[PDB]
Design a protein around this ligand. Sequence first.
Ligand SMILES: NC(=O)CCCSc1nc(N)nc(-c2c(Cl)cc3c4c(cccc24)COC3)n1
Length: 209
Amino acid sequence: EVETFAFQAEIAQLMSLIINTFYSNKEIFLRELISNSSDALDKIRYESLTDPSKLDSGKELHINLIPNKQDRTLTIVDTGIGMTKADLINNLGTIAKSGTKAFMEALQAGADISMIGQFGVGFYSAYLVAEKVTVITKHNDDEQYAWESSAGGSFTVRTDTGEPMGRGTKVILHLKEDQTEYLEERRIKEIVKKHSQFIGYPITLFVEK
Ligand SMILES: NC(=O)CCCSc1nc(N)nc(-c2c(Cl)cc3c4c(cccc24)COC3)n1
């Protein structure tokens, strides 16, 4: 069963701005997804202090970067808190706690797209480089779910079976044809060193077979 939803109007507008604005400094998408993964790891770390059983789904707190040249995908995986089905729809489909409104106003008043992470919507910078984004997530309180969107104002949610994660979130970027530099080991290393060198969890860059 696949459920299809419309993004809240302002999120669709935000996504269109990211896709259509001429803006060359696209590499910042990676810092933004790593920062979200770091935040999700801080959350599970904190919850586990009072309830150690929340780590029964995995004690390791880390971030993995997985390029795949054959599939033309870059995946950012974390063992963070993850999202229930309700969290997934709310967080990715609506303004929720984000600064979506402030960001679009800021862009009209001198801000630039690299400042997206100051507004709680850094995830959407994935659309600078990806034609489609799939988000696989597993929270201790729910089953595993797959969210997906190629923009256009809609997204889908379905249960995800056959490749269960212990806990966390996997953001799969189906790269645009002209954005394959983000699959190169040297490029990813350069971006991590430039923008994510102080993250408080191990970031492992996988090698291709
Ligand atoms: N940090 C927390 O309090 C837990 C948030 C849920 S777990 C999580 N993990 C990662 N890697 N990413 C997200 C995540 C995604 Cl995928 C996408 C969006 C998010 C937004 C805010 C916070 C987290 C996210 C708003 O913009 C959309 N959420």
